[PDB]
Amino acid sequence: TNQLQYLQKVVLKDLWKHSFSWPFQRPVDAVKLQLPDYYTIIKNPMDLNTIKKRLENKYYAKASECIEDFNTMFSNCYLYNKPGDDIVLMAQALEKLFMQKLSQMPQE
Ligand SMILES: COc1cc(C(=O)N2CCC(N3CCN(C)CC3)CC2)ccc1Nc1ncc2c(n1)N(C)c1ccccc1C(=O)N2C
Numbered sequence: 001t002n003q004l005q006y007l008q009k010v011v012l013k014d015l016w017k018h019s020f021s022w023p024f025q026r027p028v029d030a031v032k033l034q035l036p037d038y039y040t041i042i043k044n045p046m047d048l049n050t051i052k053k054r055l056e057n058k059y060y061a062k063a064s065e066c067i068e069d070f071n072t073m074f075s076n077c078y079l080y081n082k083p084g085d086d087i088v089l090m091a092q093a094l095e096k097l098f099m100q101k102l103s104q105m106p107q108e
Pocket of ligand 1 (some may be wrong): 022024028033035076081082
């Protein structure tokens with residue numbers, strides 16, 4: 001499970017420390033953001049703290065399941081929001097950081 005550890009102590013920790021990560025450190029707050037339809041049209045909401053808890057709890061069976069949750073977090077954000085929105089620019093920078101750290105994942 002060395003790929004799942006790299007995802008926890010490297011990929012997740014490096015995304016979390018990144019400047020743009022705080023909007024993604026909890027599930028999208030539909031009350032604070034005033035989004036009556038968010039949890040209606042976004043079928044698989046995802047956030048960095050959910051990924052953190054699932055890694056700590058050994059919820060994932062293989063690295064690809066956790067990687068998919070990371071991708072779902074980015075695509076939910078692109079999907080719901082609009083081109084050029086601040087949050088979308090933040091998602092993209094975090095996704096680039098995500099992809100470049102997947103570059104260095106031990107292929108085990
Ligand atoms: C309390 O959490 C946040 C507040 C704000 C902020 O400055 N606001 C929000 C509330 C206020 N409303 C006034 C009335 N207007 C109709 C809507 C906006 C304007 C001022 C900005 C980001 C916040 N945290 C946050 N977490 C996750 C996000 C996300 N943002 N982005 C921006 C999203 C915004 C809308 C829908 C989805 C998201 C999203 O994908 N994520 C990841």
